[PDB]
Design a protein around this ligand. Structure first.
Ligand SMILES: Cc1cn[nH]c1-c1ccncc1
Ligand SMILES: [Cl-]
Ligand SMILES: [Cl-]
Length: 163
């Protein structure tokens, strides 16, 4: 575990993270995809061997000894708000199981279902709160990665609010 487990936020490419493992915002079919998933494919392509997994699940594949945790959030274009919310919560619970199993002291994590799976809605708060629900009981240092300047401020404020 980390000596004083923390949450932090950085605005940069998650493919340049400084953590012991990464969470991919994966598609269910293990395809290169776009956004976070395409950056992860360019950086760790070996991790896409048998990475296909259903919505609401996470599957880890090693690139050398570096763990890539493929987490499949729901596409809110296809799911109801209610069913999508349940699957988004579930994907983050499976990420917490994998992080714990791997014994890492730190993890780089994007906000699941906030980009092309958002169904055109702002889901910063919904996605971040499910991340916290899952990860609060883990003792890894969590570093959240984003690309928007206004999102960085709002994520930083939400972390600071809990102190
Ligand atoms: C969060 C986000 C949205 N569009 N692209 C990204 C991104 C891309 C690569 N690495 C990390 C994040
Ligand atoms: Cl997304
Ligand atoms: Cl962002």
């Amino acid at each position: 575990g980390a000596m004083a487990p923390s949450y932090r936020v950085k605005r940069m490419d998650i493919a340049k993270n400084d953590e012991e493992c990464v969470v991919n915002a994966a598609n269910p079919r293990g395809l290169p995809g776009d956004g976070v998933c395409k950056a992860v494919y360019k950086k760790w392509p070996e991790s896409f061997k048998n990475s296909a997994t259903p919505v609401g699940t996470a599957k880890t594949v090693m690139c050398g000894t570096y763990p890539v945790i493929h987490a499949v959030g729901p596409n809110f274009s296809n799911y109801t708000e209610s069913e999508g919310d349940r699957e988004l919560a579930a994907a983050y619970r499976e990420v917490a199981k994998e992080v714990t199993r791997l014994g890492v002291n730190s993890v780089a994590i994007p906000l699941l279902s906030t980009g092309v799976y958002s169904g055109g809605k702002d889901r910063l708060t919904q996605s971040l709160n499910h991340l916290f629900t899952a990860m609060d009981s883990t003792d890894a240092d969590v570093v959240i990665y984003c690309r928007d300047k206004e999102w960085e401020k709002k994520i930083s404020e939400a972390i600071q609010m809990r102190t």
